[PDB]
Amino acid sequence: NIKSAKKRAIQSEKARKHNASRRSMMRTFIKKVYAAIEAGDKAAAQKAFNEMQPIVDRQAAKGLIHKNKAARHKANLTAQINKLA
Template sequence: MMRTYIKKVYAQVAAGEKAAAEAAFVEMQKVVDRMASKGLIHANKAANHKSKLAAQIKKLA
């Protein structure tokens, strides 16, 4: 489930759609944080995903 949301963000970034990428990023953040809080992934891994994708979205400006 988490990978699906991450792929959606990557797809929007690749298409150059900043608004859509930001919307997908918000959804992805919720899912990744939920997975980290349940212990399915490490908290640092969640932070790494969010940081990497936020930087790519920021480059779209």
């Protein structure tokens, strides 16, 4: 529609594909610890968890994730790795 406020539409799409690149990267690491926890390797899982720790909290700090999701993904996952340990 003819409005100079259509600038938000193009700013949305450039911010769209960018957020997909960040979130898919964020969710990729979460799947990584799941594979490690399923092999019974409590050390590798502890290792992989240490990898995504500075990642998910680097995402909540910028304003992307609402920090409670970041907390929970770590929280239960914290109790998950020591459940095997």
